[PDB]
Write a protein that binds this DNA or RNA. Structure first.
Lengths: 121, 217, 353, 121, 162, 55
RNA sequence: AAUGGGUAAUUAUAGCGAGCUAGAAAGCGUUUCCG
RNA sequence: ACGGAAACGCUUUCUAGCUCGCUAUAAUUACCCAU
């Protein structure tokens, strides 16, 4: 669950809980999750955040249900993405996405994940 | 005296070009790297930005001594036609690259065509251990002919050069045939021909009789 | 003007299959005459619903027979008296070496692959496929890239260091990117009639019988001339392309040293030009910088399809026998009878402009 | 039946109902359905999902009727596919595929099946 | 449309919009003249006319986003742009209020040689945004003049808008 | 309920100075379109009108 | 031994995610009625 | 017989100039299975 107050510090604490590359101490603290892998998940959400500002919710919810396909498929393979969606509660946040304000909150919640990934990188 | 000069060339492919975009909600096991389409007709298009980005960056090795680090450092024969934002008098210079959409909609048909964009499976093979990594990218098909619509713009500053500023257009229409018009370029992907160029005067009553015959050599 | 092109006249001396990632299954082709026919199965289904056979046709695709020619699509035509060609028009001829030579099993092939095509239907060898063959030659015959490569540094060993040839934008420093300056173009779209649909034959050292295999790749017939334009810009990528006559032979001489030793010389054939291996054929030692992959490569197949105690298995076909007769006398083109070629063995010669 | 809201959790519950390899407890919970078998069914649907975005429905319905051929033929042999199309209501979903929106829904419904197969594997 | 018409009717390079000639300033207005304020033309914002006609066709959203990286000149890097632009065959209702003041005299027919030519340069040059990379190509169709305020006859004028 | 978060839009404009081509931006605030304002015009009748209440 | 079948992997990977110019500029700051 | 009366916050102004969705990438690997 994430509200309009806490959808950022949940996303900050999520990135800090991503377990680093403790192996191979040359250039340490790198994440198993990589940048271009995470942007694939953002490009999904950062085209619904645009269309939610223009369209209504009911003419848009077909692409919203396909996020639950994509966030599982991108995490079902290449296990470092599964490390994200279990720690950052992505699949639980898609359970509560019933309105445009929450659609614009989760699509903005993903942008906080990309922000602190780039900051703590 | 003010005049506008239009160039109605025809961009005909030989190897299919891939001016990409990104359909963000693509699919699994489908095209994960599409081409940019026309948003209504869903025909593949060539934007003017992919043309202008390949006209300039291939004429910046030929008509540019003291090779430029930035596009602002072009040596003021190239900036006179391609614009230069770091200059008092070269901003928006004299060329407009209109988008080349599609011409042969029903000449590709009656050759046998399911879709106007083919899909190519491509497989990054890992050299060690022979791992496979497939990808599916779209291409505009082989005999697709596009509508090149470059527009020149004559002021009273142009005097003697007018005609100097077409050999750089003619060579930009020639240095790109030796290259690829965008694409996943190294492998095929836009070895393209610029057929039947024609300059006309669409405003201002300027003569292009001596101007056309230097575009046919 | 820094560009300088080449003409790689690729001459197929073997069945060469390329691409398309999809396959005609069984019951999707009719062996009417001594030539195959691959319809449009959506167009085939629409005519047959109009001929009121759709419930019989789904009842046709569930029940198997001890015979095999009655489990192909031609039996559904003869048991219901279909008398038109008229479908999605694509047909190739055959040789008799596709199926088992014995007549009873003839025309009972299954799961053919497809060859890569444009949207017109005329096949071609793409430039992306021909460039991957060049890269392995340029991998294995440099002394600087065939080093102790494939450092994993994490997890499992199969991760090749792809950041060993510079290719990225590489911020700060100047963009070199050797393989951007090697620009292989596609083929001319050739004709359907040079397609013969060979099958894969496995051959090991022990168990000297060459076992059949139900791959049925529609391959290019040998002795077909296909040209390629390869344009190179810089000097370093300029020099590595006319050198290929000394690079592809040095590859194949290092590749004759093992996996083309420890075999009879009957199945292996001569070169007569500069040798090269296109896709979908003899693999994992041609699609591989092979000195550092031998120990590593066999880890992936601790399975039922287990890669052998030796390096690997020879990949063979059965294609019709042809000769070139280019030297003094007819060049015999094999060293055996019974029509064995090795799959993917191509040949070329290179020339500027 | 599947609508624009429920075409994913039906597909998630379908994969969980696939009976595992309860035999041979070394590397357990493997499915009788395999990955490369399922991708053969997806490659059918994930080339109509591309052509539906470009072409109309009426110039495309010949390949749609051939899905009912393929999903029966691939399941008539090698019974683990028949375990899929009875549990995941594939042949019932092809009864209602009358429009481009439903064509793009079933072809997207198959992608949710491949996603949770890869995730629960 | 002023700067396109500025390149035709000035006879010297106007360094300011006030330095445009007396045929531009009596249409588009001038602030330094106490006689050419309250300029004759009134341009209204153009809205989507065919929002329903772009519906029930192959487009869904009325704006498409174009992905447009640059390439660095010496290091060949990339910097991706996402420039939103309207879709191809959007049709916009355009209206062009002209005010016949009693000081107009015989200039009414001279202005329509200027406005039509301003509508003819916009069909050659672009309209807003990155115009040397496409993004322009405006076609003005169904050009006709009507009198929204009384006592003028446009019967001998709609032939100029052929 | 025709979702508008603030009743005044902010329009961004600029100026292209001639001969130097350097823009000069501007942010002017405007009340949005389907705002409906209530207008009350009051015409007062006295004895000093004398058949002028239709002119 | 013949017969009848193919089967299993990967389904894109890594990078960039916008940069720089302008950020308001010219006018009018009370006029008329009035002693 | 209102510190009142008459008075448009208004005129002029393109969100514009420069910018390649590009870079590397053989649809390939393995050789059996059923009785």
């Amino acid at each position: 669950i994430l509200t309009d107050e806490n959808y950022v510090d949940i996303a900050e604490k999520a990135i800090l809980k991503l377990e680093r590359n403790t192996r191979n101490r040359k250039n340490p603290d790198a994440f198993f999750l990589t940048t271009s892998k995470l942007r694939n998940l953002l490009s999904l959400t950062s085209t619904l955040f645009d269309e939610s500002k223009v369209k209504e919710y009911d003419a848009l919810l077909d692409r919203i249900a396909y996020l639950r396909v994509q966030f599982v498929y991108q995490a079902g393979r290449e296990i470092a993405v599964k490390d994200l969606i279990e720690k950052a509660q992505i699949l639980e946040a898609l359970k509560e996405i019933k309105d445009r304000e929450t659609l614009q909150r989760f699509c903005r919640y993903m942008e906080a994940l990309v922000a602190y990934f780039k900051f703590y990188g | 005296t003010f005049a506008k000069i239009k160039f109605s060339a025809q961009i005909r492919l030989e190897t299919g070009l891939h001016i990409g975009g990104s359909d963000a909600f693509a699919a699994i096991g489908a095209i994960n790297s599409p081409v940019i389409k026309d948003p209504i007709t869903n025909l593949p298009i060539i934007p003017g930005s992919s043309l202008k980005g390949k006209m300039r960056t291939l004429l910046a090795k030929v008509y540019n001594e003291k090779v430029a680090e930035k596009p602002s450092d072009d040596s003021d024969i190239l900036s006179r036609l391609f614009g230069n934002s770091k200059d008092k008098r070269f901003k928006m210079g004299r060329l407009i690259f209109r988008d080349a959409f599609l011409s042969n909609a029903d000449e590709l048909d009656s050759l046998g065509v399911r879709s106007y964009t083919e899909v190519k499976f491509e497989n990054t093979i890992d050299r060690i251990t022979a791992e496979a990594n497939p990808r599916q990218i779209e291409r505009a098909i082989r005999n697709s002919t596009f509508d090149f619509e470059l527009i020149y713009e004559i002021t009273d500053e142009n005097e003697n050069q007018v005609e100097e500023d077409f050999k750089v257009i003619r060579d930009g229409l020639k240095l790109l045939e030796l290259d690829y018009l965008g694409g996943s370029g190294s492998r095929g992907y836009g070895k393209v021909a610029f057929e039947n160029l024609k300059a006309t005067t669409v405003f201002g009553n300027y003569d292009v009789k001596t101007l056309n015959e230097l575009l046919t050599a | 003007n820094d560009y300088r092109t080449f003409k790689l006249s690729l001459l197929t001396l073997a069945p060469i299959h390329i691409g398309n990632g999809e396959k005609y299954t069984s019951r999707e082709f009719i062996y009417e005459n001594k030539k195959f026919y691959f319809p449009d199965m959506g167009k085939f289904y629409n005519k047959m619903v109009e001929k009121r056979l759709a419930e019989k046709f789904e009842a046709f695709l569930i029940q198997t027979r001890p015979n095999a020619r009655n489990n192909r699509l031609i039996s559904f035509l003869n048991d219901n008296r279909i008398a038109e060609r008229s479908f999605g028009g694509y047909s190739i001829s055959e040789t008799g070496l596709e199926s088992d030579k014995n007549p009873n099993s003839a025309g009972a092939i299954n799961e053919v692959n497809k060859f890569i095509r444009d949207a017109f239907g005329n096949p071609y060898i793409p430039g992306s496929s021909l460039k991957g063959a060049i890269r392995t030659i340029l991998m294995n015959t440099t002394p600087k890239w065939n080093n102790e490569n494939a450092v994993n540094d994490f997890g499992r060993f199969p991760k090749e260091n792809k950041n060993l040839i510079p290719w990225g934008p590489k911020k700060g420093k100047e963009y070199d990117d050797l393989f951007n300056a090697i620009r292989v173009s596609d083929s001319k779209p050739f004709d359907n009639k040079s397609l013969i649909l060979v099958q894969k034959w496995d051959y090991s050292a022990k168990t000297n019988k060459a076992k059949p295999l139900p791959l049925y790749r529609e391959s290019i017939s040998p002795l077909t001339k296909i040209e390629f334009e390869i344009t190179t810009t810089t000097d370093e990528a300029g020099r590595l392309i006319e050198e290929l006559g000394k690079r592809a032979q040095a590859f194949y001489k290092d590749y004759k040293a093992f996996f083309l030793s420890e075999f009879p010389d009957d199945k292996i054939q001569a070169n007569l030009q500069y040798p090269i291996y296109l896709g979908a054929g003899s693999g994992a030692w041609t699609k591989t910088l092979f000195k550092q992959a031998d120990g590593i490569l066999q880890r992936r197949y601790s399975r039922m399809k287990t890669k052998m105690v030796k390096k690997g298995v020879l990949k063979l076909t059965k294609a019709p026998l042809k000769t070139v007769k280019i030297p003094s006398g007819n060049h015999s083109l094999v060293k055996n009878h019974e029509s064995f070629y090795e799959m993917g063995k191509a040949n070329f010669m290179i020339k500027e402009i």
